[PDB]
Protein backbone atom coordinates (compact mmCIF):
# COMPACT_ATOMS: atom_id res chain seq x y z
CA UNK A 1 0.00 0.00 0.00
CA UNK A 2 2.28 2.77 1.35
CA UNK A 3 -0.32 5.55 0.96
CA UNK A 4 -1.92 7.86 3.48
CA UNK A 5 -2.41 11.52 4.37
CA UNK A 6 -0.39 14.54 5.36
CA UNK A 7 -2.28 16.64 7.91
CA UNK A 8 -2.18 20.35 8.64
CA UNK A 9 -2.78 22.08 11.97
CA UNK A 10 -6.32 22.75 10.74
CA UNK A 11 -6.45 19.02 9.83
CA UNK A 12 -6.51 19.61 6.09
CA UNK A 13 -5.51 16.36 4.40
CA UNK A 14 -3.42 15.72 1.29
CA UNK A 15 -2.50 12.36 -0.19
CA UNK A 16 1.03 11.21 0.48
CA UNK A 17 3.37 8.25 0.17
CA UNK A 18 5.66 6.52 2.64
CA UNK A 19 8.75 5.34 0.79
CA UNK A 20 11.02 2.61 2.09
CA UNK A 21 14.72 3.12 2.73
CA UNK A 22 16.10 1.35 -0.31
CA UNK A 23 19.87 1.00 -0.60
CA UNK A 24 21.90 -0.45 -3.45
CA UNK A 25 24.23 -3.22 -2.24
CA UNK A 26 25.99 -6.23 -3.72
CA UNK A 27 24.39 -9.44 -2.45
CA UNK A 28 24.84 -13.05 -3.57
CA UNK A 29 21.66 -13.97 -5.43
CA UNK A 30 21.33 -17.51 -6.77
CA UNK A 31 24.33 -17.51 -9.10
CA UNK A 32 26.65 -14.51 -9.25
CA UNK A 33 26.98 -11.56 -6.83
CA UNK A 34 24.38 -9.08 -8.06
CA UNK A 35 24.07 -5.39 -7.27
CA UNK A 36 20.44 -4.75 -6.32
CA UNK A 37 18.14 -2.59 -4.22
CA UNK A 38 17.11 -3.71 -0.75
CA UNK A 39 15.84 -2.13 2.44
CA UNK A 40 17.95 -1.39 5.50
CA UNK A 41 15.40 -3.12 7.73
CA UNK A 42 15.64 -6.12 5.40
CA UNK A 43 19.43 -6.40 5.51
CA UNK A 44 19.38 -5.77 9.27
CA UNK A 45 19.09 -9.51 9.94
CA UNK A 46 17.35 -10.88 6.83
CA UNK A 47 20.11 -11.33 4.25
CA UNK A 48 23.88 -11.44 3.81
CA UNK A 49 26.08 -9.72 1.24
CA UNK B 1 -4.54 -27.61 -58.68
CA UNK B 2 -4.07 -27.25 -62.46
CA UNK B 3 -7.85 -27.51 -63.03
CA UNK B 4 -9.18 -25.29 -60.20
CA UNK B 5 -7.28 -22.05 -60.81
CA UNK B 6 -9.04 -21.74 -64.16
CA UNK B 7 -12.77 -21.32 -63.56
CA UNK B 8 -14.60 -19.86 -66.57
CA UNK B 9 -13.90 -18.50 -70.04
CA UNK B 10 -15.05 -15.03 -71.06
CA UNK B 11 -17.25 -14.60 -74.13
CA UNK B 12 -17.53 -11.02 -75.36
CA UNK B 13 -17.09 -9.18 -78.63
CA UNK B 14 -13.64 -8.04 -77.50
CA UNK B 15 -12.66 -11.56 -76.44
CA UNK B 16 -13.89 -12.83 -79.82
CA UNK B 17 -11.89 -10.20 -81.69
CA UNK B 18 -8.96 -11.53 -79.68
CA UNK B 19 -9.81 -15.15 -80.55
CA UNK B 20 -9.62 -14.05 -84.17
CA UNK B 21 -5.95 -13.92 -83.24
CA UNK B 22 -4.36 -16.60 -81.05
CA UNK B 23 -5.58 -14.81 -77.90
CA UNK B 24 -7.87 -16.47 -75.36
CA UNK B 25 -9.40 -14.86 -72.28
CA UNK B 26 -10.10 -16.66 -69.00
CA UNK B 27 -11.35 -15.83 -65.52
CA UNK B 28 -9.13 -17.36 -62.85
CA UNK B 29 -8.53 -17.59 -59.12
CA UNK B 30 -7.55 -14.36 -57.40
CA UNK B 31 -4.39 -15.73 -55.73
CA UNK B 32 -2.48 -17.27 -58.65
CA UNK B 33 0.11 -15.90 -61.05
CA UNK B 34 0.49 -15.87 -64.80
CA UNK B 35 3.12 -18.61 -64.57
CA UNK B 36 0.66 -20.97 -62.89
CA UNK B 37 -1.90 -19.95 -65.51
CA UNK B 38 0.45 -20.81 -68.38
CA UNK B 39 1.41 -24.16 -66.87
CA UNK B 40 -2.26 -24.97 -66.29
CA UNK B 41 -3.46 -24.27 -69.82
CA UNK B 42 -0.47 -26.15 -71.23
CA UNK B 43 -1.29 -29.14 -69.02
CA UNK B 44 -4.99 -29.12 -69.90
CA UNK B 45 -5.31 -28.20 -73.57
CA UNK B 46 -1.89 -29.55 -74.65
CA UNK B 47 -0.68 -26.40 -76.39
CA UNK B 48 2.32 -24.07 -76.17
CA UNK B 49 1.95 -20.63 -74.62
CA UNK B 50 3.84 -17.52 -75.72
CA UNK B 51 2.67 -14.76 -73.38
CA UNK B 52 0.10 -14.30 -70.65
CA UNK B 53 -1.19 -10.92 -69.53
CA UNK B 54 -3.42 -10.43 -66.53
CA UNK B 55 -5.48 -7.83 -64.69
CA UNK B 56 -7.52 -7.42 -61.52
CA UNK B 57 -11.06 -6.05 -61.54
CA UNK B 58 -12.60 -4.37 -58.52
CA UNK B 59 -15.97 -5.13 -56.95
CA UNK B 60 -18.81 -3.30 -58.66
CA UNK B 61 -21.59 -1.86 -56.51
CA UNK B 62 -25.12 -3.13 -57.11
CA UNK B 63 -28.67 -2.53 -55.92
CA UNK B 64 -31.75 -4.73 -55.98
CA UNK B 65 -34.88 -3.62 -54.14
CA UNK B 66 -33.55 -2.00 -50.96
CA UNK B 67 -30.75 -4.61 -50.78
CA UNK B 68 -27.48 -3.07 -51.95
CA UNK B 69 -24.12 -4.77 -52.05
CA UNK B 70 -20.95 -5.50 -53.96
CA UNK B 71 -20.15 -7.99 -56.68
CA UNK B 72 -17.18 -10.32 -56.38
CA UNK B 73 -13.74 -9.22 -57.44
CA UNK B 74 -12.43 -11.17 -60.39
CA UNK B 75 -9.07 -11.84 -61.99
CA UNK B 76 -8.84 -11.98 -65.77
CA UNK B 77 -6.07 -13.51 -67.86
CA UNK B 78 -5.29 -13.29 -71.57
CA UNK B 79 -3.04 -15.97 -73.06
CA UNK B 80 -1.38 -15.54 -76.45
CA UNK B 81 -0.21 -19.00 -77.51
CA UNK B 82 2.24 -19.64 -80.34
CA UNK B 83 0.47 -22.46 -82.19
CA UNK B 84 -2.70 -24.39 -81.46
CA UNK B 85 -6.40 -23.84 -80.96
CA UNK B 86 -9.02 -24.53 -78.31
CA UNK B 87 -12.40 -26.00 -79.23
CA UNK B 88 -14.64 -23.41 -77.63
CA UNK B 89 -18.00 -22.32 -79.02
Amino acid sequence: ASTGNRRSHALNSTKRRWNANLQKVRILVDGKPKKVWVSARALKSGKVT
Amino acid sequence: EARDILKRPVITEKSSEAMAEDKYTFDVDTRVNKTQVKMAVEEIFNVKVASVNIMNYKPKKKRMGRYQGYTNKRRKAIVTLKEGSIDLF
Binding site: - | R3, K7, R8, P9, I11, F89
Partner: protein
Amino acid sequence: KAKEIRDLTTSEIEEQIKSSKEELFNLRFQLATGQLEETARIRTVRKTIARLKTVAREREIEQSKAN
Protein backbone atom coordinates in the same frame (compact mmCIF):
# COMPACT_ATOMS: atom_id res chain seq x y z
CA LYS C 1 -22.96 -44.25 -53.04
CA ALA C 2 -20.37 -44.56 -50.27
CA LYS C 3 -20.79 -48.36 -50.18
CA GLU C 4 -18.51 -49.18 -53.13
CA ILE C 5 -16.04 -46.48 -52.10
CA ARG C 6 -15.14 -48.47 -49.01
CA ASP C 7 -14.50 -51.32 -51.45
CA LEU C 8 -12.22 -49.34 -53.79
CA THR C 9 -8.45 -49.72 -53.59
CA THR C 10 -6.96 -46.43 -52.31
CA SER C 11 -5.61 -45.42 -55.76
CA GLU C 12 -8.74 -46.00 -57.81
CA ILE C 13 -9.98 -43.31 -55.41
CA GLU C 14 -7.16 -40.99 -56.45
CA GLU C 15 -7.83 -41.54 -60.15
CA GLN C 16 -11.58 -41.14 -59.73
CA ILE C 17 -11.01 -37.84 -57.93
CA LYS C 18 -9.17 -36.32 -60.88
CA SER C 19 -11.59 -37.84 -63.40
CA SER C 20 -14.47 -36.26 -61.50
CA LYS C 21 -12.56 -32.97 -61.41
CA GLU C 22 -12.15 -33.05 -65.19
CA GLU C 23 -15.88 -33.70 -65.51
CA LEU C 24 -16.68 -30.74 -63.25
CA PHE C 25 -14.30 -28.52 -65.21
CA ASN C 26 -15.84 -29.39 -68.57
CA LEU C 27 -19.32 -28.87 -67.15
CA ARG C 28 -18.44 -25.41 -65.85
CA PHE C 29 -16.92 -24.54 -69.23
CA GLN C 30 -19.99 -25.64 -71.19
CA LEU C 31 -22.12 -23.76 -68.66
CA ALA C 32 -20.18 -20.54 -69.18
CA THR C 33 -20.77 -21.19 -72.86
CA GLY C 34 -24.51 -21.55 -72.62
CA GLN C 35 -25.01 -25.17 -73.70
CA LEU C 36 -25.36 -27.35 -70.60
CA GLU C 37 -29.13 -27.79 -70.00
CA GLU C 38 -28.49 -30.29 -67.13
CA THR C 39 -27.20 -28.33 -64.14
CA ALA C 40 -27.77 -30.87 -61.35
CA ARG C 41 -24.73 -32.96 -62.32
CA ILE C 42 -22.40 -30.39 -60.77
CA ARG C 43 -23.76 -30.75 -57.25
CA THR C 44 -23.69 -34.55 -57.19
CA VAL C 45 -20.19 -34.52 -58.68
CA ARG C 46 -18.91 -32.22 -55.93
CA LYS C 47 -20.54 -34.44 -53.31
CA THR C 48 -18.92 -37.50 -54.90
CA ILE C 49 -15.52 -35.83 -54.53
CA ALA C 50 -16.39 -35.08 -50.90
CA ARG C 51 -17.26 -38.76 -50.35
CA LEU C 52 -13.92 -39.82 -51.78
CA LYS C 53 -11.87 -37.42 -49.67
CA THR C 54 -13.77 -38.40 -46.52
CA VAL C 55 -13.09 -42.10 -47.00
CA ALA C 56 -9.43 -41.44 -47.77
CA ARG C 57 -9.01 -39.34 -44.63
CA GLU C 58 -10.56 -41.98 -42.40
CA ARG C 59 -8.31 -44.59 -44.03
CA GLU C 60 -5.34 -42.46 -42.96
CA ILE C 61 -6.82 -42.14 -39.47
CA GLU C 62 -7.12 -45.92 -39.23
CA GLN C 63 -3.52 -46.29 -40.38
CA SER C 64 -2.36 -43.87 -37.70
CA LYS C 65 -4.44 -45.56 -34.99
CA ALA C 66 -2.71 -48.78 -36.01
CA ASN C 67 0.71 -47.10 -35.89
